[model samples]
Target chain A: MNDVRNDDPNFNVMGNFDHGLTLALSKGRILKETLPLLATAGINLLEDPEKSRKLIFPTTHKQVRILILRASDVPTYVENGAADLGVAGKDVLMEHGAQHVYELLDLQIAKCKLMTAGKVGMERPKGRLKIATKYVNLTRQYYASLGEQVDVIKLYGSMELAPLVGLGDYIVDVVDTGNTLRANGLEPLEEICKVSSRLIVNKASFKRKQVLLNPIISQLEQAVQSR
Target chain B: MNDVRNDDPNFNVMGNFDHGLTLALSKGRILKETLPLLATAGINLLEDPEKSRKLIFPTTHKQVRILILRASDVPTYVENGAADLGVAGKDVLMEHGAQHVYELLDLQIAKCKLMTAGKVGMERPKGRLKIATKYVNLTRQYYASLGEQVDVIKLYGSMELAPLVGLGDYIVDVVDTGNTLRANGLEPLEEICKVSSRLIVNKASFKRKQVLLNPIISQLEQAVQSR
Candidate 1:
């Protein structure tokens, strides 16, 4: 690996100078928690993402920048090579049918579980079971594996409202505290998968830029271990 | 048609109330613009949806209630009979496929246009073009109509950023003030369709509850005309 040194002696040494790295992240909880992890990797954003209206921000390292996107759009950005790497939740990756990116490390932040939820004391209907969720792909696969035929309704948001209003019998959604579900008179019925944010890399970039990328990955892994 | 009167003299007279009427509406822009239109029809909501945490709200009339849902989920709720009627933007209805709902009236509340946009003066690439948009179905149909084969990347939000970062060459999105596109250094390339919120009703409910629904429809039609 070629050592690239900046003129400023105080700047951290970086490997390779072919191109700068772009890290894609979503706003809200994930971004809030991921910042500390990025700091541990010696990458600190120059601006506060929450306060700035800009979608792209430069980092303290001249060779790295950050791209803020919708949680659901992070995978798409990385997969399309618009972003070299991205931090995405398992729920989004599963729903997006992750096919194009390399799933690298489980950073373990933004922990939650995907589960089937329904109104308290609600009995399963006799006929075809209807399930509503944003994770339609994941929901279908889960029921199909059990040899059950279920009708899946795609809802963009407010999954809890579906059961209450008779749109669907149950909902498949991420349950973090189970408070949202219980507040809506719903209960988590079955666990589908444990969800957490994972680091993903574009296929071509992973191979072509490994000299610049590998060290950053190793640092994040160490940070995860320390936790 | 049967006449139904409330015991309270101040309550507006309504038609037959064999069953209560549920109107589905999405929160934010559409909802803000829709309230006055509903008021013209004497169907005023009892609570401010923005201030209330309740997803469902009662109207001034005892027999009518409202279901606040995501813009994309409005069609799903109405089509599945969870809501007998709904008002949705043309962009959403087209993308949702509008399968089981009757397109009743063009409320024209949230007026906008669906168009293809790209970075200013950006040229098409040599190979197959990649387009990013939330409306996958609509984008496919639009391109198919032109006999063009292009790759479509589905994105949940922030489409304008797609082209800036190389996610896609172009984006198909709704343009209202044209400010968002301009701010992102994008310009409208081609007009796909003029969009406005339209009142939609569940097919079965439209026929089964016409006696209760027709009067409200007529009132909205007049409101549209007078505007």
Candidate 2:
């Protein structure tokens, strides 16, 4: 492991770039949003049909690469300087407790609402609520800011199943269409926040690759503005 | 929250037989193998219409109900007594470090090998190997048993990507056909363990529902033998 020092002259860890500018992108939903944005910016992304399962792809421009990483891993890639830039949902960023980065623009895609949900008419009493969610840290922090203690039940998947199976008092999850929730007998009780995709740049990459990154940022900003 | 001592006569954590038996089965390759065996044992099954999702249906006898859960969450569901019985692969069971269960029978389905793989013809001196895998705990233990220390990098999916991306020196993962590994320019360096699906029963459920569970076990045994 490299010893990262605060006082080291080479402390420009964030500014360190050796290969190409690597972009970390969330695979399913956010990937749909970023491809058009990157195309609009005139970035030529090389396709590897042979390695379609492989998420990492090199671009024809020789100075850029795109890594299709998990939404949860996007923050880690950017934070560790493994990726120069990252595209992720604000909900994912909040869940990871990531700081040390800059949110350049709201991509205005993959919009959803984070909320507390439960069976209709089974409202939870005012106090500490047992909330089951994949976003344990973010859920705790969100409720804490509102001066409430949340008993977080960390479920890897199926937050709706938690409440239905009586494993949790309520569930904190993203409500996109609410179809799955309603089908599972859950109703949105309260909205915590609205979420959307964001273009995040590694703090050091912003300073070092400013020339290469700025145009994409401006193009994406215009794209979002048009929406 | 309730401190029910094991020695206490009143310590019946699992509810009585009046409640319908719930069996949790995992999704994917092993699921196909499990269903026919279950059907022969007189358990009714349903196939979800949407993209091969795990289908859950009740038996005509109304004695049992099955739920399809993610491969990763099977342990949690069983451990929490949400499901009395669960069918999962050894690879997943080892990775999660699950306890409070008894292995009933080796279903001998979806056979595969968990192995350490690396770039073909690559050699490293005898020392700690940097290994990447989704089965971090299982991989670490397997190497540790041989008095070798391993540095493990955890990846959520696409195990073959680890070596190609310089994420780790080698990968410890399950290889069924070895096609994915070979396609990704990797070869098996060493075999860790052979894997197959197993019938796992929660400790409390086994004790309380032995009468109901025994018939299912016997029926499965006969079904496997007849085949």
Candidate 3:
């Protein structure tokens, strides 16, 4: 199995799978949720990521390695072919418009809802509404779909603070429990979309490494189905 | 002073200083360092922000409240007039191109340096150098100023991983001790700029709330001097 393989330079991306499969895992809950599914796919981490400060981890499988990344960055790594495959939230994929990467599997992990939230009982603005969000592109597209022209304020984090300070009329964020919103005196108003982690692959890798990816994808699909 | 003050709605922003002053502080070390300076400025948080999960913290000063925000977002909040004042790192301000907010004072907290780093003893790429950085605008500007035509890869976090994975030839990131770089088998190359937290004020708030802001600024100036 380790003998000479038909390695094509033209189609395969540079730095992709230099050794074996490189899977990018989004940090936090997404990482945790995807672990069981990944185990079901015969991949397991040698070290507990939560206990270490390292970004790259060697897996139990010799041909596979992992990169821990911010949820927003998973797509970039995969698309750039730094990682052959990545676990990314649907909301992140929506915002990134990852045209280069192929979204192959809905891993169905870390489920949540992307919603528009505002201060409790706050009246709708008389004029144009301002939405503060990390997902500026998605928010604009969402509102534009309804023909509602609104201003979008791009903020990096803590969107729940936006409504309290009147930074924006509403905030577009993923809501898991709605507890944070209620605690901040914000109420979820409109549901934008259902969100979950999806298994995405670099197009070049999918094309070149089908023999390696097919098993992983098949196992993940089964794992998700069983769950 | 509580008597009929000259209330001018013309220059004042709609939601600015609704009750009193809204000050935004960047989270993590910047927040911890700024707290003592804020205390010297006659502002003190009613609750320990580190212990509390709240985004908004009420200060002892009746008119002033604090908003805990990501360092990158401090400028946006202040520029939007949602926060009358904010403490932001110079690197963040530079990266954000925060023209709407006035950088009033350099509080000199959370000092660091922005630099380019790459894998230790790694040979330069043959073609155009690709720089991975969260500060896309600043990175492009820096390279352009040097008459270097390079591609910039926008990344949100863990920039050190970029070089190891061959995603980019170099990474532009805020370097404090160079420990993280060395740990990742990378070395700092060129110095970009020195970074420190500065007091930023919204233009509208500066004009309308000068009477309320004067004493705080004076006290902060003195505190910086004393330190």
Q: How many residue pairs clash in all the candidates, one count each?
A: 0, 1, 0
**Minimal lDDT window, size 10, model 1 chain A:** A9-18
Model 3: CA > 4 A from native: A1-18, A46-48, B1-18
Among these predictions, the greatest lDDT belongs to 3
Model 3, range B79-124, lDDT digits (tens) per residue?
8899999998898899898766888898888888999898899788
Docking class of 2: incorrect
| TM-score for each predicted model, relative to the true structure | 0.88, 0.78, 0.89
Regions more than 4 Å wrong, model 2 = A1-18, A43-65, A80-82, A98-102, A123-130, A143-152, A203-211, B1-18, B49-62, B121-130, B142-151, B225-227
Give residue A44's lDDT in candidate 2 (0 to 100).
43
Model 1: runs farther than 4 Å from truth? A1-18, A46-48, B1-19, B42-52
**Residue pairs whose backbone atoms clash in candidate 3:** none
TM-score of chain A for the candidates in order shown: 0.88, 0.83, 0.88
- For model 1 the interface RMSD, in Å, equals 5.1
- In order, the candidates keep a fraction of the true contacts of 0.71, 0.09, 0.62
Deviation from native of the Cα of residue A25 in model 3, angstroms: 1.5
lDDT of 3 at B166: 77
On the 0 to 100 scale, the lDDT of residue B74 in model 1 is 92
Model 2 over residues B1-227: C-alpha lDDT tens digits? 54422112211222222255778788667778888888787665533523533234444334576666777777766766767889988998888766878888889887899998887677774666788787888888898889888877666656676565555678888888898788767898778999988889989989998888999999988877635
Better of 1 and 2 by DockQ: 1
DockQ-superior candidate, 1 or 3: 3
lDDT at position A58, candidate 2:
55
